[PDB]
Structures are given as structure tokens and as C-alpha cells.
Amino acid sequence: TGTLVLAVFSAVLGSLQFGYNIGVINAPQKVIEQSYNETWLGRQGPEGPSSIPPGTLTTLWALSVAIFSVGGMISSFLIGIISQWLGRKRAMLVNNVLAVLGGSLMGLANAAASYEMLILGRFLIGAYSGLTSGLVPMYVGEIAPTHLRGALGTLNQLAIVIGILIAQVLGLESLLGTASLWPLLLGLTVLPALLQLVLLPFCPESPRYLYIIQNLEGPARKSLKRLTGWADVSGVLAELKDEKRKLERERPLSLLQLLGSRTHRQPLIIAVVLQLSQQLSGINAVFYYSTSIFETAGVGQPAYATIGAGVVNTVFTLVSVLLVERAGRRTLHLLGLAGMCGCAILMTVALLLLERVPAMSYVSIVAIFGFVAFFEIGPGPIPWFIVAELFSQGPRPAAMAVAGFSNWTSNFIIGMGFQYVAEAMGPYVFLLFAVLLLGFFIFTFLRVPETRGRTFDQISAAF
Ligand SMILES: C=C1[C@@H](C)[C@H]2[C@H](Cc3ccccc3)NC(=O)[C@]23OC(=O)/C=C\[C@H](O)CCC[C@@H](C)C/C=C/[C@H]3[C@@H]1O
Ligand SMILES: *[C@@H]1O[C@H](CO)[C@@H](O[C@@H]2O[C@H](CO)[C@@H](O)[C@H](O)[C@H]2NC(C)=O)[C@H](O)[C@H]1NC(C)=O
Numbered sequence: 001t002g003t004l005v006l007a008v009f010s011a012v013l014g015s016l017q018f019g020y021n022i023g024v025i026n027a028p029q030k031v032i033e034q035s036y037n038e039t040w041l042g043r044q045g046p047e048g049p050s051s052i053p054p055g056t057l058t059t060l061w062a063l064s065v066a067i068f069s070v071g072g073m074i075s076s077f078l079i080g081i082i083s084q085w086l087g088r089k090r091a092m093l094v095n096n097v098l099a100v101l102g103g104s105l106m107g108l109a110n111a112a113a114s115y116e117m118l119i120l121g122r123f124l125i126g127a128y129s130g131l132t133s134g135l136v137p138m139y140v141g142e143i144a145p146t147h148l149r150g151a152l153g154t155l156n157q158l159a160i161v162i163g164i165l166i167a168q169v170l171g172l173e174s175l176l177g178t179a180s181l182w183p184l185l186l187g188l189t190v191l192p193a194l195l196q197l198v199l200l201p202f203c204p205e206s207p208r209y210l211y212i213i214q215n216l217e218g219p220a221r222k223s224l225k226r227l228t229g230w231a232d233v234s235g236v237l238a239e240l241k242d243e244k245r246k247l248e249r250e251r252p253l254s255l256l257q258l259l260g261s262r263t264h265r266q267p268l269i270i271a272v273v274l275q276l277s278q279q280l281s282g283i284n285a286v287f288y289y290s291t292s293i294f295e296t297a298g299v300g301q302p303a304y305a306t307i308g309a310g311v312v313n314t315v316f317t318l319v320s321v322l323l324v325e326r327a328g329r330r331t332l333h334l335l336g337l338a339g340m341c342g343c344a345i346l347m348t349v350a351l352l353l354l355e356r357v358p359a360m361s362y363v364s365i366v367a368i369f370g371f372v373a374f375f376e377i378g379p380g381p382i383p384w385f386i387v388a389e390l391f392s393q394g395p396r397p398a399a400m401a402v403a404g405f406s407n408w409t410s411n412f413i414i415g416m417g418f419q420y421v422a423e424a425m426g427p428y429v430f431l432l433f434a435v436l437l438l439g440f441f442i443f444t445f446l447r448v449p450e451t452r453g454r455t456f457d458q459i460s461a462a463f
Pocket of ligand 2: 034038050051052
């Protein structure tokens with residue numbers, strides 16, 4: 001079994017870096033922005049304006065978080081080709097090389113007196129995160145024995161969320177996230193990539209990719225022997241043999257085929273809109289600008305309350321793993337969307353009514369926590385399950401590629417536009433999210449069937 005824990009450890013490390021990179025921009029903002037100002041002052045000359053014009057600064061710092069989503073977008077198309085050509089292990093190793101390059105470019109921003117280097121570093125780390133999000137679930141679910149596949153499935157979520165929380169707690173003013181040690185945060189996100197790069201080559205290749213694609217038999221037999229610790233593994237090998245034959249029985253569809261194929265259309269629309277529901281809900285607005293939101297809202301020590309948001313995220317992800325197994329699929333999405341809309345309305349009421357009673361700033365805090373909480377029940381995991389259960393073994397690759405691309409593009413939209421929207425509208429930002437949620441809730445209530453424990457024949461015939 002040891003081989004199994006080691007391999008899952010490497011995959012989880014990749015996922016944990018994904019989480020770190022998602023969450024590490026919320027706390028250091030007011031410091032990182034300052035650096036930009038300083039650098040932008042140094043390149044003007046004698047008659048300069050003595051300050052970076054606010055618009056230029058807001059746009060630079062918004063790019064510095066949307067470029068990550070651009071990296072993910074470019075990933076979503078590539079997840080398949082490298083997986084098929086190199087495999088799972090080799091893809092992750094090349095991926096770690098790209099990760100080190102991107103993070104190193106991130107961390108050397110201060111010395112270079114350049115804000116382009118950090119933007120490019122975010123692009124590279126975004127491509128990393130896209131590929132590793134694509135390639136960790138595949139591998140862990142690939143190797144894990146039949147019974148434990150469900151349990152090892154959720155390790156990716158715990159990993160990502162713990163990574164986010166670690167990033168948020170390392171951005172405090174007493175800890176790394178300070179005036180002169182912020183780039184070392186980005187160096188830190190470099191660091192675990194080396195540990196994974198030096199640990200993985202001591203782990204086995206996915207038997208399924210070694211049998212179904214490469215046609216190889218003996219190496220797969222050795223890998224199974226060295227993974228499961230069984231005297232005889234004939235049954236599993238035969239099962240994958242018939243799996244290869246079934247895959248040959250119905251070859252997968254190309255992306256354009258899926259897009260233009262009438263029969264597989266309506267489920268494709270459901271997948272796309274559920275991803276848009278996960279993202280345009282506004283969760284990434286919280287994960288990226290919690291500190292800014294709180295400081296606007298009258299909180300005393302915004303970084304601490306952001307840590308609170310991260311801890312709520314972790315706790316309710318644990319609850320989600322322990323609950324989703326016994327609740328349904330549409331039901332949890334509905335409940336999460338409704339709770340999130342209510343929490344956004346409460347946030348708007350708290351911001352609007354802050355002047356009249358300052359001691360109500362605390363209310364804002366709880367609202368956001370509720371928000372995050374109600375996101376990790378309904379719209380956090382459920383969209384991916386619904387995407388999985390709406391498609392047979394044939395067209396899953398293309399369907400997942402489309403869902404992921406839509407997810408990343410909507411993430412870019414929210415991450416780039418939140419600053420401008422908040423500046424323009426003011427305390428009303430969250431009202432907008434509330435409206436979206438309600439809108440989407442309508443859709444989800446009356447357009448997505450319940451897929452829990454429902455036969456693929458029943459699912460398809462329902463449409
Ligand atoms: C707020 C977000 C962050 C915080 C996560 C969030 C929590 C989560 C994490 C892991 C699985 C399911 C839910 N819920 C997500 O969906 C999350 O993460 C992923 O989707 C990660 C990997 C997936 O297995 C493959 C798809 C990976 C990408 C194609 C999509 C990534 C989504 C992010 C999301 O931006
Ligand atoms: C951009 O950075 C400069 C330099 O720190 C800021 O200018 C200083 O601002 C203070 C007030 O906060 C003035 O009293 C100082 O005299 C300014 N420095 C100099 C050298 O004149 C500027 O305010 C910053 N602006 C933003 C938006 O960050």
C-alpha cells in the first residue's frame with residue numbers, strides 16, 4: 001500500500017500548490033500595489049506626476065490576477081493532448097518544470113523593478129494550475145484501488161482548500177506578507193514544486209494509460225503488482241482489457257463534433273451554464289479581494305477576518321465531503337444558490353447601513369462567511385458531478401474540456417471586472433451578485449434533472 005500513499009502524496013502536493021496560488025493574492029494586495037507605485041515612479045523623470053494615476057494602478061493590479069485565469073483557459077484545451085502523448089507522470093513532471101519557471105519569474109519582480117515580470121509569472125503559474133487541476137484527479141482516480149477510489153477522490157478538494165488557507169495565513173503583516181518579504185511568498189509557491197519533482201519519479205505509472213493507450217502489458221502487470229500488493233492481479237487486468245475493448249467499441253468525439261452534434265447538445269448547455277453558475281456567483285471575488293472588501297466594510301483587522309473566511313472554507317468543504325454522499329445533486333445546488341443569494345443581500349444591507357450604526361460592521365463579516373459556507377455546499381462540488389453523470393464513457397473528454405474552458409473564462413471575467421464594478425457602483429456590488437444568483441437559481445431549479453443514483457438511460461431519456 002505504501003506505493004499508493006506516496007503517489008497520492010505527489011498528486012495532492014500538486015493540488016495544494018493549485019490552492020496556494022488561487023488564494024495568495026488576497027492579503028498582500030495593499031503592499032504589492034504599493035511596490036507598483038514605487039516602480040512606476042522610478043521610470044518617469046523629473047517632471048513626473050509624483051503618483052501613479054489611480055486608473056493605471058487598478059488596471060495593472062487587475063491584470064495581475066486575471067492573467068492566472070487566462071493561463072487556465074489556455075490549459076483547458078491542452079489537458080488532453082499531453083495526457084495522451086506523454087502519459088500522467090511525464091505530463092506532471094514537465095508541468096512542474098513550467099511551475100518552477102513561472103514562480104521564479106513571479107518572485108524576482110521586486111529586484112527587476114518591473115510589474116510586467118509578475119504578470120508573466122502569473123500567466124505561467126496559471127497554465128501550471130490549469131494543467132495540474134486537469135491531471136491530478138485523472139491520476140489519483142486512475143491508480144487508487146477499486147474500493148478506495150471514492151475516498152481518495154476527495155483528497156483533491158481538501159488539498160486545494162488547505163493550500164488556499166495556508167496562503168492566506170502566510171500573508172499577514174507579521175509573517176511573510178509584509179513590505180519587503182512579499183516576493184518570498186511567490187518563491188514559496190515555487191518551493192513544493194521541487195519536492196514533487198524529486199518525489200514523483202519514485203512512483204508508478206498509471207496502469208490504465210499503460211494498457212489502454214500504450215498497449216503495454218508486462219509493465220502494467222508489474223505496476224499493479226507493485227501498487228496493490230497482490231499475489232495475483234489477473235482479474236483487474238482482464239477488467240481493463242474489456243475496458244479497452246469497450247473504448248474501441250465507441251471512440252470518443254472531437255471537440256467540434258461534440259459542439260455540433262445535435263444529440264449531445266442539451267447536456268452540453270447544462271454543463272456550460274452550471275460552470276457559469278459556479279463562477280459568476282462571485283466566489284472568486286471573495287477569494288481574491290477579501291481584504292479589500294473587508295477594509296471597505298469597516299472591519300478592524302481585515303487580514304484576520306480573511307483567515308476566518310479560509311477556515312470556514314476548509315470546515316465546510318469537510319462537511320460537504322461528509323454530506324454530498326447522502327443528499328442528492330440538484331437539491332444541494334439549489335440550497336447553496338439560495339443561501340448565497342441571501343448572504344449577498346445581507347452583505348449589501350450591511351454595507352449600505354454602515355454609516356448610521358458603525359458597530360454593525362461585524363455583520364458584514366458573518367455575511368461573507370455565510371457566503372463562503374453556502375458556496376462549499378451547493379455550487380462548489382456539484383457542477384463537476386453533474387458534468388460527470390450527464391455523459392457516457394464516450395464523450396466525457398470533450399464535455400469536460402468545454403466545461404473547464406467556460407469555467408476559466410468566467411473566472412477571468414469576474415477577476416478582472418470586480419475592481420471596476422466595485423469602484424463604479426459602490427456598496428451595491430453584491431446586490432448584482434444576488435441578482436445573478438437568483439437568475440441562475442431559476443434556471444437550475446427547472447432545467448437540470450436529478451442525477452444521483454440515476455441510470456444513464458434514465459438520465460438521457462429524461463431530456
Ligand atoms: C472557486 C474555485 C476553487 C476554490 C475550487 C472549488 C472547490 C473545489 C475544489 C476541487 C474540486 C471541487 C471543488 N470549486 C472548484 O471547482 C475549484 O476547484 C476545482 O475545480 C479544482 C479541480 C477540479 O477537480 C477540476 C476542474 C478545475 C478547473 C477547470 C475549474 C476550477 C474550479 C475551482 C474554482 O474556481
Ligand atoms: C504613490 O507613492 C508615492 C510615494 O510614496 C506617494 O506619495 C507620497 O504620499 C505622501 C502622502 O501619503 C506624501 O506626503 C509624500 O510627500 C509623497 N511622497 C513624495 C516623495 O512626495 C503617493 O501618495 C502614492 N500614491 C498611491 C495612490 O499609492
